[PDB]
From Swiss-Prot, chains A, B, C:
Shown residues in whole-protein numbering: 387 to 578 of 578
Function: Produces ATP from ADP in the presence of a proton gradient across the membrane. The V-type alpha chain is a catalytic subunit.
The organism's taxonomic lineage, starting at the top: Bacteria, Thermotogati, Deinococcota, Deinococci, Thermales
Protein name: V-type ATP synthase alpha chain
Protein family according to the UniProt entry: Belongs to the ATPase alpha/beta chains family.
From Swiss-Prot, chain D:
Similarity annotation: Belongs to the V-ATPase D subunit family.
Keywords: ATP synthesis, Hydrogen ion transport, Ion transport, Transport
One GO term of the biological process aspect: proton motive force-driven plasma membrane ATP synthesis
Protein name stated in the entry: V-type ATP synthase subunit D
A molecular function (GO) term: ATP binding
Function text: Produces ATP from ADP in the presence of a proton gradient across the membrane.
Shown residues in whole-protein numbering: 4 to 158 of 223
Top-rank taxon: Bacteria
UniProtKB/Swiss-Prot annotation, chain E:
Residues spanning the signal sequence: none
Residue spans crossing the bilayer: none
Keywords from the named record: ATP synthesis, Hydrogen ion transport, Ion transport, Transport
Protein name as annotated: V-type ATP synthase subunit F
GO BP term, pick one: proton motive force-driven plasma membrane ATP synthesis
Keyword Ion transport in annotation: yes
Function: Produces ATP from ADP in the presence of a proton gradient across the membrane.
Keyword Amino-acid biosynthesis: no
The organism's place on the tree of life at top rank: Bacteria
Originating species: Thermus thermophilus (strain ATCC 27634 / DSM 579 / HB8)
Sequence similarity: Belongs to the V-ATPase F subunit family.
Record-level Gene Ontology MF annotations: ATP binding; proton-transporting ATP synthase activity, rotational mechanism; proton-transporting ATPase activity, rotational mechanism
Curated annotation (Swiss-Prot), chain F:
Protein name: V-type ATP synthase beta chain
Domain of life: Bacteria
Organism lineage string: Bacteria, Thermotogati, Deinococcota, Deinococci, Thermales
Organism of provenance: Thermus thermophilus (strain ATCC 27634 / DSM 579 / HB8)
Keyword Transmembrane: no
GO biological process, one term: proton motive force-driven plasma membrane ATP synthesis
Keyword Ion transport carried by entry: yes
Family: Belongs to the ATPase alpha/beta chains family.
GO function terms (MF aspect): ATP binding; proton-transporting ATP synthase activity, rotational mechanism
Biological role stated in the UniProt entry: Produces ATP from ADP in the presence of a proton gradient across the membrane. The V-type beta chain is a regulatory subunit.
Keywords tagged on the record: ATP synthesis, Hydrogen ion transport, Ion transport, Transport
Amino acid sequence: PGGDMSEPVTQSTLRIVGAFWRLDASLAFRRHFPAINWNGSYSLFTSALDPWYRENVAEDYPELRDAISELLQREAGLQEIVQLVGPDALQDAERLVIEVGRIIREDFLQQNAYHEVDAYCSMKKAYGIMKMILAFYKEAEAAIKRGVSIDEILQLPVLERIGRARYVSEEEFPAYFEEAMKEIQGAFKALA
Amino acid sequence: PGGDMSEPVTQSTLRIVGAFWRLDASLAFRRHFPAINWNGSYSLFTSALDPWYRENVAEDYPELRDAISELLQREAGLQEIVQLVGPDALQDAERLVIEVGRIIREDFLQQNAYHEVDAYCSMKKAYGIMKMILAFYKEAEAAIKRGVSIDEILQLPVLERIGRARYVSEEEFPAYFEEAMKEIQGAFKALA
Amino acid sequence: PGGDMSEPVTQSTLRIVGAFWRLDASLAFRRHFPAINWNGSYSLFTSALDPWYRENVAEDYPELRDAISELLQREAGLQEIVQLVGPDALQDAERLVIEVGRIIREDFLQQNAYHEVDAYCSMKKAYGIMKMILAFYKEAEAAIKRGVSIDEILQLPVLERIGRARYVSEEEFPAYFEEAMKEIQGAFKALA
Amino acid sequence: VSPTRMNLLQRRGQLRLAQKGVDLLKKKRDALVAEFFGLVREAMEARKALDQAAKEAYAALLLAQAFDGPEVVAGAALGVPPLEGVEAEVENVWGSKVPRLKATFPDGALLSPVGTPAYTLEASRAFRRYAEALIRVANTETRLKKIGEEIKKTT
Amino acid sequence: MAVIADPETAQGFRLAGLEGYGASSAEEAQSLLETLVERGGYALVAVDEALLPDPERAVERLMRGRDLPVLLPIAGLKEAFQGHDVEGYMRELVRKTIGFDIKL
Amino acid sequence: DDDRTHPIPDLTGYITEGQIQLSRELHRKGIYPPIDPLPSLSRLMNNGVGKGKTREDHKQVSDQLYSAYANGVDIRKLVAIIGEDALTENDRRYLQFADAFERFFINQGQQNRSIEESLQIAWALLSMLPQGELKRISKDHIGKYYGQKLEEIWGAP
Amino acid sequence: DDDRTHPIPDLTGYITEGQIQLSRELHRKGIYPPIDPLPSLSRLMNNGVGKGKTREDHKQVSDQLYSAYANGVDIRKLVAIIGEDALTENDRRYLQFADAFERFFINQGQQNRSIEESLQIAWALLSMLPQGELKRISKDHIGKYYGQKLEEIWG
């Protein structure tokens, strides 16, 4: 009724189901969809599908999934300090994590059910998007130790390439990914 | 019983009344009587009563009352500045409206029900008091725009004349108003 | 049921008993036994037993008990500010009260039922411990008034002497008390 | 938090404590603002004294450099040791420690202790007084900044 | 301690014992100031108004962890002789500290 | 449960004409009787005091004591943070007045005090504050009763 | 609803001789098994521990671990409000001990640790704290077991 998930029907349902997809009214008001609360949700079928994933998608897919989950957890942890001290007090390493978490939230989790292309997404397309995001994060992490300012990293034009990747069709996506990886590598090579 | 207006009887009364005179305990604690909270109170009969006011009291009554309401609104908007710094350390225009609001609050809204002459007040007396306050505010605004000191205006005995106006008897009030309405002009003309 | 003190059985019992020893779940969680909630407990037999304590224990024992209760009340009063602005914002004279309250809670009120010696405690041993704690508090306050910082007061080795007076045997306590009383006098004289 | 009457009473007690804390913090902020406005007047006075201390020392130095000779002043300046005894002591203000600046320069280390170039030696004295007036301005400003940031944090 | 100003008053301060630098442009002022910030030594620096308007605007990312050294603006030779009202500087300072900018 | 919103206290407030509330903090501090002045209220007090009954300075003295105690209990909590050295010259007067009030006017023990003795003690406590700062009391009573020291009653308080 | 005050766990706790309570917060961080030590309780612990049964230093080590973990958990709620940069060294030590405890003692995976290995890890974690702060442990056991390094167990 009121979003109160202590009501008897929800509590009786949670004792037998194997997956729990919790929705949030806070994300729905800001038009963030599918508005899945990734902190309260869980799935008990993840450990059994790993042999299927390791031969049907890629051998390193669970590692990338765990890395994405760890990045989301670190962003959620840093968001308390962000709103209790202000974004100016954070160090550049934490600013990079905050920005990468924002990029992940805007470009991978968000999906449009009415768009003619974004309504459907294959497993390999999501794998490519995760690879691009993790490669960008690794390059930006390497650039921090070299003394590159965080403002120089963020104003790079390769950020828009990652954001627009989910709108590419399935037939054109491998050509997009193959060029985008080299674009990321060259863009982080050309500085400092 | 709870103080707040969320009690069911108050909520049911809220939907079927045309006027609402909310009393506040903070004004009662400070011995400010009547304790009518002018921010939370409202009335829905003003527009229908406007034709009657302009024919029986004075032609300029509604606009002169709206000026008083606007002046009271302006004084409440500067309270967030007086919370940090003292009222004396402000701009001349900011000080003038605060002094005018204090004059209104302590000399026009306040009444004593146990007093012989402060328990009753007709419409003409209130209209004259408001006219005197408006004339004083306008002359003080002109003097501030000419760059006069604030303390040379607060020293004037006009403050006592307006302050004792509510205690003037009803039969003696026209002479008091006739004296004061030109005494204010004479006091302001004597200044530099 | 559920630890709710508004249970009708508890409410009916509250109106007929002379002593009420309320227990705390939070203190039992952190293994602080006997876990008696000092704020919620009371006793009505304190005034009637006072002539017996003067004859059988000590002449000034009720005064020491009242001083300890006053110190606990003062410590409880300051905890409303520690939760607000942190412990470091307090003055040194109040940090001394906080540390003395912590000392009393850790050393006097705590008792281990399964220990060989700490399972039983006579009245004179508790009186000696209370006298030691009050003497230490008075000497610490006198040192604070002379300009000594609180950090070097808390690091004195006599603190370990007080904290392990629980496990001293009953027959060995009259010598330990006299040694610690001389050490308390000696420690705060050479320091400043 | 499960719904019980005891939990409801605890929550209401927490609300009362929060309101009391808000009032206490408002009073503390008022005290800090009063101290800030007390300090700003001394800051202005120190700065306007530093202005005159700069002006008269500059005039004396210009006169000494003009009418004793630039060579004489340069030769006098060639035997002036640089300052090394700069001291930065610390003092507490509202739970924060701030540096206070002072120097321990010995006067007799300069060449020609007898002032044959009298105007040059007077200019040296004027510049020493100029530094001894500047340190007060520095201390007052470094106190004022910390008071301002404490007011910011309280707000 | 060191003062960066015109060469006439730089060596005039050196007559008292300070390390006076003769500079007239903001680029050399920024370079010398960052050299003094990165090195260990004195904790007080006086800068003329003709070189750097705000001392914090050059160490906004360098001195946030080590704010102990004092960077102070000072008046030049020409500015001191003609004089100015210091109330404008305090009016800027009160705005930079409490934000409201209204003061009397 | 020390709850003022319980039905038994709630329905009592609709019928009675005030309340006297005991304080647990004053009880734990050793004060008997632990009557708390600030939350207490008597509705019909104005009809029983004045001229021709008890004494004429009763109402103003009571109001001044209430206001001064309310100021002192508010200063006392800020003392714990900002310290006594940061206070003004009158905040230290109010802070001492609150302690003297709690130690003398309330903590009377098993004594039997007449109204004249209580008014004498109240005027002795009000003498600690500077003359003319008592805004709630007119100058006519101030010129008649102000000035007595508490040490004249401290011989046998 | 993760509710300990529900009638079924409440009536279960009054009959049984203890409980083992799992924590969802520890589960969300990948810790297995996610056993929460503070709500857990064993009523019959004192019968099966001590000299001649497991070792002479079992109960004191358990109590010291409980107190130190409670102190760290309490300090976490303080740094959630005032920030970690204003901490003293003791609060920082307790805060680091809590994280080391959660990362090493509770989190063990599928391995079968013996009692001696678990006591060795417990003494290694207690070595991070100052020796004088171990109030609940007798000095005889401290002189025998204190000083172990954690890097000699986990690399």
